[PDB]
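The passage that follows is intended for readers who have already worked through the single-chain material. We present the inputs for a multi-component assembly, then the predicted structure in tokenized form, and finally a short commentary. You are encouraged to pause after the input and sketch how you expect the pieces to fit together before reading on.
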Amino acid sequence: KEDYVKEALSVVHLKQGVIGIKVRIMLPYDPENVNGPSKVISDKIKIFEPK
Amino acid sequence: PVKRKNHGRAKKNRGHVKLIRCDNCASAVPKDKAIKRFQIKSLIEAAAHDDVRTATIYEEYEVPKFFHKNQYCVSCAVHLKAVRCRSAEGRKDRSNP
Amino acid sequence: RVRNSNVKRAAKNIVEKYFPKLDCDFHHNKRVLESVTEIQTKRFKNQIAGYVTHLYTRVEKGKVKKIFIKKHEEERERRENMIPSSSIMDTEKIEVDDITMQMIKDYCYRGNY
RNA sequence: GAACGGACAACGGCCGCGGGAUCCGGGGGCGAGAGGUGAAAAUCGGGGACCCCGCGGGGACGGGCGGAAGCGAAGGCGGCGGCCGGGGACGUGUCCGUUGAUCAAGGACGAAGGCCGGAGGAUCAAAGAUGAUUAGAUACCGUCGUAGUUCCGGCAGUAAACGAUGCCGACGGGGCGAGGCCAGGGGGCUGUGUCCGGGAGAAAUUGGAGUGUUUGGGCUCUGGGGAUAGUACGGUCGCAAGACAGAAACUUAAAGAAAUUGACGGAAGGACACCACAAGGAGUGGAGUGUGCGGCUUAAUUUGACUCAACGCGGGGCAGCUUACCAGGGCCGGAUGCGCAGGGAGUGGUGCAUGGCCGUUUGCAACACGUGGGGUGACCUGUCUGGUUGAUUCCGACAACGCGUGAGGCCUGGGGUGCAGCAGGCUGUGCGACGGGCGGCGGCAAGCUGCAGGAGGGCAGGCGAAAACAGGUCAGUGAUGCCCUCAGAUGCUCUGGGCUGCACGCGCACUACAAUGGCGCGGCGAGCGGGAGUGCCGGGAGGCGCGGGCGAGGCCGUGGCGCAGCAGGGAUGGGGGCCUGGAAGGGUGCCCUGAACGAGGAAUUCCUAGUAGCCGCGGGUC
Ligand SMILES: [Mg+2]
Ligand SMILES: [Mg+2]
Ligand SMILES: [Mg+2]
Ligand SMILES: [Mg+2]
Ligand SMILES: [Mg+2]
Ligand SMILES: [Mg+2]
Ligand SMILES: [Mg+2]
Ligand SMILES: [Mg+2]
Ligand SMILES: [Mg+2]
Ligand SMILES: [Zn+2]
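Having made your guess, compare it with the prediction:
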């Protein structure tokens, strides 16, 4: 959770009142951290191939 | 709506079936609508059957059966659990186990 | 405790892909699992490798109807090829009951009641 | 339509025979209760009940067999035999030959209850009477009891008189049944149920409710939104009760049908939990005190919150500040655009205008999509019969298949030790447990359970789905809409007072009621937290000067007291000494006074192992 979802809060003041808009976004896994977390989610596993 | 195809009783091609009295409630239920459970069990209960073997005068005494037709009205038959709670599709079962 | 589909479908794949490299002892059965997979956390390895041993015990008995192993049908086709005692040679002068012969009265052979 | 044949028949009317049961009378036995109920009472019982056995009388009623079985036009019809009468189906080279179908009017029959006259009266039982229940109980329950229930002659003419389905007729799928007659070739007629399809239908369903917008077989009746109302008037019928038939004025935007999802149920069955219970432990409620809430008071005793989810909560331990309140006094953060405009400020109002956050449902296990299927549809399946799990966790069967959140995995601490590094030892890196092994249940099993091995076999936390709630917060906010206030201010600030008032109600805690104790010495003494000790003065509190630097109740040993409102208890109060602060109602220390309380009513909380409880210590606040 602390790696993969980054969440935001911005508040809006209008004629009528206050509006709060929360945006929470899941990140894609990428080994280079420019796009997302390097370590995978713990439940996901990889199996190699027998041939 | 019409809940049962036979309307609860077994009356078909009659106008009138004579009422009987409930064995538990003394209600007036027709003989067709009434829940009837014929119980045939031994007079002496099965726990005491070893104690009657020691006490009989007779070699190979057979303990007699008790014959009774329990006839229940609909209200007490679900209360005495002579009829079991079933589903809507389970209502159309007719066979005894 | 009860394993979930994240473990059971995983451990089903491990015994299915890599059956001959496995064994009934758990610690050897875990030692293949770091060598042949990538599982991050060491408890969840023990969740998987434990159920692999609980699978490999009953697949050694061959009880599961789902998974399919290359060794286990080639041993099965030897069992499939029974030395055939087919009753087509064992039945001689076939006893067919009284009305069953009457339907074959156009072209007939081996007549017996 | 008529005849005939062999059958069939709870079809009717009558006559005769019979059956046992209820009740009563009477005799004999027995000897204290019986009855009745959820529990009892009423009631009957040494004047012999109940119960047991015999006899007798009388009325009513046909159990078992007895069924989706028969018959009748319906109401209805059930012991047996007989008489008289009827009936349909079947069978037929019998007769007649269209005699038919349906119906206003009319006629007959018509359950129960009711009515009239007569007979009878065992049971049951409206009314009535009681005994209870209940807040009440005119009821439900118990007992008694009249009409009635019964028969005969008549009236009446109604029922959820139902298949809620008019009669006649043509056509229309299979299966299974336990009818009757015929045939002898899983047969035909005719009844009768049932199951699955077709078609129909708003759907439930349905062999007609089918052959209907591809709308036309005949005939009769009825309906036209709900309510008024099956009421009134008039009529006819009736001994009467009433029946038949049958409106309107006024009023109303729905009433209704079938089904879906919820929710609920004093419905049945599960599952689960120390806001459950059992088995327990300690309590609370009683006492005094501390604190919170209400009420009252007050210049003010600011205010939010009132079932869990208000009430030692707002990190709310308030002397000022805090602080919103009261009594006063100051001060103008009244900018800026030419006295006005408007900004700004407000612990002023509104959390029922909001954001955010938090609580609660949760201490839960639920939620959803893609596609497909079922249905006209809402919806359902997926998301489940069963088994399993803390878990919609999984096994499995499956019109579903695949996925996704949550659960798990996970993260932190805890124990065991491998290596490494360094110095009340420290911190990196790993390993170690998965329910693995074994035994028994369950077996595609999931799993459950016992033992061994083991440091460890449900460790403690953390994050915590979708949906909600008019939950709480505008008094955390330079988070805020709107409303109100802005110079004699609802602004800020200062001083004083209050938030600490007290006939009272309540929550949570504290200390106790003592001997398993208390008091006085000696001895041994923790973890979180790692900053603090030292020397001197003082009886203590405290003070002063240096200054890298800590450890508890208790327990053990022992001395006194010795069941006492007592050396238990330490409330209240008096006098003195100090600390902090600008300021004591604060804290501390000394002496003295020495309250209730002798085990705490109805109620009620928490808790399964290093846990409850007891016992201190440290930190937040300061
Ligand atoms: Mg009837
Ligand atoms: Mg006597
Ligand atoms: Mg009558
Ligand atoms: Mg009568
Ligand atoms: Mg009379
Ligand atoms: Mg009576
Ligand atoms: Mg009239
Ligand atoms: Mg309905
Ligand atoms: Mg002030
Ligand atoms: Zn009954």
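Commentary: Residues 1-3, 5-7, 9-16, 18, 20, 31-32, 36, 38, 67, 69, 78, 81, 84-85, 92, 94 of chain B lie near RNA strand D (CB under 10 Å from a C1'). The two ends of chain B are 30 Å apart (CA to CA). How closely did your sketch match?
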